[PDB]
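User: We ran a pulldown and think these components assemble together. Before we commit to crystallization trials, I'd like a predicted model of the whole complex to look at. Sequences follow.
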Amino acid sequence: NMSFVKETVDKLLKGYDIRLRPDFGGPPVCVGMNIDIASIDMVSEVNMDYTLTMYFQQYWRDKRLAYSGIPLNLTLDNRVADQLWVPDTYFLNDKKSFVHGVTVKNRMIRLHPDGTVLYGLRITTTAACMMDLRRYPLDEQNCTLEIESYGYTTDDIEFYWRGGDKAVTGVERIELPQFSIVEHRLVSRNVVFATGAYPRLSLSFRLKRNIGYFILQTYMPSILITILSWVSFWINYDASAARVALGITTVLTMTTINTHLRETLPKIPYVKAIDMYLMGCFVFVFLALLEYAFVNYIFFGRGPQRIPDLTDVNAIDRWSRIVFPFTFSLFNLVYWLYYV
Amino acid sequence: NMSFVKETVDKLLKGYDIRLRPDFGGPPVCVGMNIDIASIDMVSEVNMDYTLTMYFQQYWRDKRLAYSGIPLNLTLDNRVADQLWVPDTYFLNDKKSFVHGVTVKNRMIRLHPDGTVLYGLRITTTAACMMDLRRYPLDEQNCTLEIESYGYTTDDIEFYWRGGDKAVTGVERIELPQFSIVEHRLVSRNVVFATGAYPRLSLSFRLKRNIGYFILQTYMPSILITILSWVSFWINYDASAARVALGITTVLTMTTINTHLRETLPKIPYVKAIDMYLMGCFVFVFLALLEYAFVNYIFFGRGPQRIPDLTDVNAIDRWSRIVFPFTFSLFNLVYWLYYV
Amino acid sequence: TTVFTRILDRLLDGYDNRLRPGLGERVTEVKTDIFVTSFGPVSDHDMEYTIDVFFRQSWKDERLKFKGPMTVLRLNNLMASKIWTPDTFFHNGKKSVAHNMTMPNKLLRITEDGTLLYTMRLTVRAECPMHLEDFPMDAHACPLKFGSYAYTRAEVVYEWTREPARSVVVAEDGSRLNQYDLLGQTVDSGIVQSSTGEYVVMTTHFHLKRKIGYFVIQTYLPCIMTVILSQVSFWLNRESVPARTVFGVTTVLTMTTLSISARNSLPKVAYATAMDWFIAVCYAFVFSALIEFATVNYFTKRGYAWDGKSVVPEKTFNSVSKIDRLSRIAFPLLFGIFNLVYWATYLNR
Amino acid sequence: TTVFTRILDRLLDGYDNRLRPGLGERVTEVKTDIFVTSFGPVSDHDMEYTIDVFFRQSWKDERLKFKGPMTVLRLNNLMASKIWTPDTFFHNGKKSVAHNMTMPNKLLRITEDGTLLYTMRLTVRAECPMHLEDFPMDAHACPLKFGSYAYTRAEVVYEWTREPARSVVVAEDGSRLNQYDLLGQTVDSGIVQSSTGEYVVMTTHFHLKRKIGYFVIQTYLPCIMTVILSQVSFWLNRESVPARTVFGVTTVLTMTTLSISARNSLPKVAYATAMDWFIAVCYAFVFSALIEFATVNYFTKRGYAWDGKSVVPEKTFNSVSKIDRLSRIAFPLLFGIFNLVYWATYLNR
Amino acid sequence: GDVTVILNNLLEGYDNKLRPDIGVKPTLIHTDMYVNSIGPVNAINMEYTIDIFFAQTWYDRRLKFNSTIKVLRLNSNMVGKIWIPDTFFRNSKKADAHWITTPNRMLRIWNDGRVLYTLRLTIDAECQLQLHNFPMDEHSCPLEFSSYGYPREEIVYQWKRSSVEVGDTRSWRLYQFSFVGLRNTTEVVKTTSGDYVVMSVYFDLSRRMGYFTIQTYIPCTLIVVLSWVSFWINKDAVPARTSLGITTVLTMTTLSTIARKSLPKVSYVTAMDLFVSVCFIFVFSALVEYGTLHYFVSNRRIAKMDSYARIFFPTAFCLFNLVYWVSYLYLG
Ligand SMILES: *[C@@H]1O[C@H](CO)[C@@H](O[C@@H]2O[C@H](CO)[C@@H](O[C@@H]3O[C@H](CO[C@H]4O[C@H](CO[C@H]5O[C@H](CO)[C@@H](O)[C@H](O)[C@@H]5O[C@H]5O[C@H](CO)[C@@H](O)[C@H](O)[C@@H]5O)[C@@H](O)[C@H](O[C@H]5O[C@H](CO)[C@@H](O)[C@H](O)[C@@H]5O)[C@@H]4O)[C@@H](O)[C@H](O[C@H]4O[C@H](CO)[C@@H](O)[C@H](O)[C@@H]4O[C@@H]4O[C@H](CO)[C@@H](O)[C@H](O)[C@@H]4O[C@@H]4O[C@H](CO)[C@@H](O)[C@H](O)[C@@H]4O)[C@@H]3O)[C@H](O)[C@H]2NC(C)=O)[C@H](O)[C@H]1NC(C)=O
Ligand SMILES: CCCCCCCC/C=C/CCCCCCCC(=O)O[C@H](COC(=O)CCCCCCCCCCCCCCC)COP(=O)([O-])OCC[N+](C)(C)C
Ligand SMILES: CCCCCCCC(=O)OC[C@H](COP(=O)(O)O[C@@H]1[C@H](O)[C@H](O)[C@@H](OP(=O)(O)O)[C@H](OP(=O)(O)O)[C@H]1O)OC(=O)CCCCCCC
Ligand SMILES: CCCCCCCC(=O)OC[C@H](COP(=O)(O)O[C@@H]1[C@H](O)[C@H](O)[C@@H](OP(=O)(O)O)[C@H](OP(=O)(O)O)[C@H]1O)OC(=O)CCCCCCC
Ligand SMILES: *[C@@H]1O[C@H](CO)[C@@H](O[C@@H]2O[C@H](CO)[C@@H](O)[C@H](O)[C@H]2NC(C)=O)[C@H](O)[C@H]1NC(C)=O
Ligand SMILES: CCOC(=O)c1cncn1[C@H](C)c1ccccc1
Ligand SMILES: CCOC(=O)c1cncn1[C@H](C)c1ccccc1
Ligand SMILES: [Cl-]
Ligand SMILES: [Cl-]
Ligand SMILES: [Cl-]
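Assistant: Here's a predicted model for the assembly, 1710 residues in total across the polymer chains.
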């Protein structure tokens, strides 16, 4: 048994040239790929990337490795991969990645009698995706993973998804705390550079951000502060200290709400959907404070000289008691219909 | 001619013993050192370290490497450095360092006909320097790089700065946003441990902190809040809500200035120069608030029952309008003269 | 397969990869071009930036001539470590990565005349010294210098593969900038001098202009609204002493918080940026509103406001402060004029 | 020159570095000492500390005896990989660093009798379990345990080079501690029992006392000033309801910020520290001063204060509250007494 | 040396590319684990650190030898010379063996061919946490390991009698959690490359409540009690009660963001969120209570609303606390 297997495996590597791909100087070698996704984590808008753990299996035929007389698929110790040709697959958008190495290098080489090689790697890769945050936190991102051959063109190597649409598994078991993976899809194409045309496999996910976290942390605190700025409409116009303190505090609170949200995001130059709401709530609490200044100026600035009446101080307060809750509801009605 | 170089180099490394230093069993090998400092950055008070990038050149003569018949200085592929003896130079205060490795290892080997070796390395090192922050931010720091031989004592090796005070270049072109390099100093001495006396080269920089940042961040806001607190002295004694709100907020605003400053510094057990100012400015805003409570108590507590007079609140307020600005300038006079 | 194995074995037989091609005869000439797959984020605090490149080099090695069934030998990267390759390094680089997932991202191609093509995927983090006087309306030319580490210009020189402007190519979709616009790149060549000789340097300058949108939303707009807020108190009656004092004190406290929090991402430079000047003037307007009211309060004769019933002839009532009436115009007008001057000054640089 | 090459060649010829010296014949004895070149920062959050050492080991190996023109071979650390060395590991060691710049920071020395000296420079990160019930007045004994990973005490035993106290030496200028003092070290040895046998373990305890100065400045003083600030309102007239309400609310909210900001240094332990008790009592004093005013306001009849002219006949005017008069004495006295008891409780112990 | 001769004979003709019994039977590997410490639980990343001495025992008939020596006690030098199983941890986010001062590995070979292989590991293991009951939550964090390449027909793992041993738990770096117990299971997981024997250890963890009581519950409770001080302040003090009412709401907003700062941005409502939100309702209603009282008395039984609020508000917060704490401490 083991004498024959050891004799056979030694025979395969004797005279093997790792510098030459299978069918070197001939037809392209076809490499099929399966990805089993272990997890997705650290989807960072700050860093514009996501971290992916996966089992990255590659399949190809090397007729130099065909063996006979052994009705077995030979799973060899993974160090034999240093003695064999393997595809020079790389991830174009991969910022940082490693093959896990405990307790050994998380790598698998399985030979088959006809010369087929199954080569699996356990890889954690931090791949870059640039996120369009104009609809944040109601945004829907699309993060990919480009898979390409570095030095071998379509004349030397061909990529395909093994199993077609079933080539990637484990997507339905991924739990992202902030997202739900709406869809994933698989793309095969060629990419042209100045050095040749290279086969590319593309795996992309569509992440829809969950909104429940931002209701509790940003939207409900803003609505309650905006509502509490309307309390000044029922306070007597004489109580200037009370209404200014109520007015100033809500304007201050809106900034404090915005700063907490501001500090956990990149410095994108455009206005996000969350900024539109916070700016909207700021306008409402600012106008409420300006409403008392108008009430104060009408009574004291113009009183001695002697649509709301604009001369009756209590008429302006009665008008504001209706318009501000109505308009804010109208603002929330428009904002949520546009973004949900 | 190129075949003659290949033959000559092969002859040098045939029988070469990398385990033995030049002149093994004989006089110590003299190693000359140059440094071209590429940049200094990340001078961290939190981590008590600075990061230094340099071209680190070592010069020694290995008679085993003398070659004749080639009127050239052989620059060889840096991988030949692993076949030659090189000094076991290390940095004692080095926390984290690496030789740059793109596109290849940033390493230079240049042989010379008489056997002299020039061995260059591009190194980024994060060396430790404990900083005395008692006068921070008006402080000068002295941060060093301690270069030493690990295994060879002064019987086996001698360090020297090659070129005297011109051994280290590029210091004058270093631009740090927060510091200005006042001077750099080169020291050569011996350090004794239990295992013997070892050569040491010390490269030290005297760093003076620029205060322009801290004027904008800490001092000016503190000065303005303290001046703001004096507005209370021009408000009538009976306006308790106005003067208390003015006094309370300035006391709080001093805390806001301090907490932001505290968050960016290490846990330092002593009072820094910046702490003396903030605690000095806190006393002034606190006394300004305590001035009103005293004024309120005189009028309302001691009033019904019947240096300023201490019975007329207007006199106390008018006395405060002069003494508080005058004393604060006196405090600024003593502070800035002592720390400059 | 033995045909191509015998060719590779013959090439490496008696080959010394410690010796550069032409060592002792001529200068090795390395043709270089760069394909930027992504111009990564710029870090103001570290004064650096990240760039992802296909770094291509090409040189002639007469020891690697061959004749065979093919005119180009497309080999895996492990052949590159068997031959001589240039020791190129980035002069302003900080911590660069030569990617090797899942294998070393390098390609080596040998043509029958000895020409070698050698490209590698690199992520370079390079220094970009910045002058932040005009921040956040500043522009920078971030350099990318490279050359041989050990070989002087008498041994190794670098040249651009094509027209120098066309030898650095940025991908259409390859932009990881969040707050900068890549306006283009200037490509040059030069000679640097060290303690070890004269070296050829290949330089690329990436011209970046900062996008002001973030700082308008997070700093300029909150400052402008605080200044407008501080002037609301000019329209309140002079007898609302607790109310107008809260206006002045709170707005100063807000300006202090904005001023302190506005330099978080910047290096602690010793000069004033354009934003520091804006916050200073906004602080001055806010501070002067509280000084304005304290002056108004100093001439308030009576502690009671108008009751809304009694006629005021010309008991007695305070009149509307003349300082307030002028402040209701002068303060909004001087701040509008300052913004016109401030924005025309820096948006035109 | 070749004289010493033949000695080294002879030493390794037939040498088996898979086998410890004296295997099957005796117990290998390893002498050990530590030179602490710096005692790095202590991390409360990770409950670990850093320490940079020269870890010196020495043992006898008869296979390495030699006769030559030297009595000690001071060899390259490359030689140490060719011979058996102890497999010492730190039992409570976290991620530790073997320094490799510019070369492996190791020395190997062979004397003619076969004795080996083998020292290395290590950055050791070791676990230090902390009991933070007394924080910020806590003291710790941070352990450093090491021994053979693979060899039981019947195979490899460790001893200190000198007297155990003198075998761990800290450099005079090496203190990298910021908020601790290195009072001293206790050096001991023992046996640890595992499922794989009995192992010799060498123990050193570094005794660290936290320096309270940072927390006096940043936590205790702001708490004390806040409590003192809240008792100021006892001296204002009882009719300044908005003024005395701002006093109470502001100080209560300030203590809330102080309490939350106080534990930012610590790991999120589930028990109360000495700082938490001080802040809790400071919270009670600040909260009670506001509750005191509410009781005063509940007995305040008239909404106007004394006009400054009318004589109170001991319209009518409110009297000065007896609660206010009592609180002017009781609150400073009780808080002064609490501070005396609190500090004597923890500073003395 | 006789041990040298034995070691050389064992490795002569040995092919460490081949698993023992490669075409005969599966290799049975017995695993032990000694837990040095279960490090911090990182809720934000959903991971925990564990330091283990991981022991594996199998039989390699190619390593049999006859001599008076009954066992070869070896260091890490021979670990790469013989065959070693490719055990990996399936939920490991990041793992690292130890290398100071040498590779912390142990190899022992007995004369009947039994191999004992031990090494020290630090593993950042993935642990998905359901934080609905936070901070009164309980978790069973797994640690799965299997063979990377050898299926169930080639490698079978098997727990020994003393499968997992834990030392002095008091030294562990579990700040917010208490270790309750562990279970070790075995199962076959079907992947695309075959069926694999997967071994799991589950560490039951209960969160300690003390930190969040100090950090969140007490501060939020005190701000709620603070808002009740307004009910005893005279209703004519409009600036006093309006400032008191509105600053509590501002403070309760600041406390809300701090409470969730230590959690992943999960989008469901934890027990902490419920407490903070209800405390928000109490401070919000107190300000609305005075606004209603002020409008109906000045800006004009309802006039006695302060007397009702003095009782109803403390009673409703006590009642909510009674329901909140009972449901999350004894109920589901
Ligand atoms: C992309 O590129 C990167 C590089 O840019 C690449 O990373 C590299 O990956 C390779 C593997 O593919 C690594 O190489 C192996 O590393 C093994 C250990 O790795 C751990 O330790 C690393 C540091 O090791 C130092 O210390 C140990 C002892 O503590 C020592 O054994 C090492 O030689 C080395 O010592 C040097 O440096 C120290 C200072 O650090 C000096 O003090 C010392 O003097 C010496 O100079 C550490 O870097 C690793 O961390 C990395 O990897 C982990 C994952 O593993 C990851 O989590 C981290 O984040 C980090 O990335 C890790 O902790 C090492 O055992 C291997 O060496 C074997 O095999 C080689 C084969 O050529 C042989 O030459 C060696 O002698 C040794 O032989 C073994 O040794 C075993 C242990 O003793 C023993 O059981 C065996 O029986 C055999 O023993 C000897 O055998 C010889 C014959 O071979 C015989 O003569 C003897 O008598 C004896 O029997 C090997 O070096 C490499 O370290 C990685 N480099 C870096 C920088 O990370 C990455 O993989 C690439 N990716 C892809 C996808 O391609
Ligand atoms: C209503 C009334 C109510 C009344 C209530 C009363 C309640 C009263 C309650 C009083 C409680 C006081 C508790 C103090 C505990 C101190 C413990 C201790 O040892 O601390 C030390 C100080 O540590 C430090 O960091 C020093 C801090 C300096 C602070 C300067 C303040 C300046 C003020 C200016 C005011 C000006 C005013 C001007 C006015 C015109 C710790 O350090 P160490 O261990 O000693 O050091 C050991 C190491 N070395 C350095 C020796 C080598
Ligand atoms: C730090 C700087 C300090 C500067 C201090 C400068 C202070 C200063 O000059 O005050 C004077 C006056 C006060 O203005 P204001 O209208 O508030 O005060 C009225 C003024 O005092 C009248 O004289 C009073 O009438 P009378 O005759 O007593 O019956 C009147 O009494 P009553 O109607 O209430 O009964 C007061 O209300 O202001 C100016 O003239 C504006 C100049 C341009 C101001 C431009 C500001 C931009
Ligand atoms: C937590 C709940 C605590 C509840 C505490 C409840 C404490 C409690 O019940 O106090 C009542 C009393 C209030 O005294 P205080 O001086 O504040 O109030 C005066 C008192 O009510 C007089 O009786 C009034 O005169 P009169 O006879 O109407 O003419 C006088 O009115 P006027 O002359 O101004 O017009 C009031 O100002 O306090 C003490 O005696 C202090 C003892 C120490 C009390 C210490 C309390 C901390
Ligand atoms: C881990 O698994 C082992 C089995 O591999 C369990 O040990 C068994 O415990 C039951 C208890 O009823 C005994 O009947 C068996 O004989 C044991 N098997 C042995 C000793 O091989 C052990 O209980 C498990 N540990 C857990 C679940 O914590
Ligand atoms: C006219 C709109 O101004 C504002 O909304 C505004 C001005 N100062 C502050 N804010 C708000 C709080 C804000 C700032 C930044 C982003 C989102 C929301
Ligand atoms: C009288 C001394 O008290 C204070 O200075 C004091 C009390 N609360 C706050 N502060 C100030 C802001 C401070 C504290 C700590 C460092 C620097 C400055
Ligand atoms: Cl950017
Ligand atoms: Cl420390
Ligand atoms: Cl924890």
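The first strand of chain E starts at residue 27 and ends at 42. That may be worth checking against your pulldown data before setting up trials.

User: Thanks, that helps.
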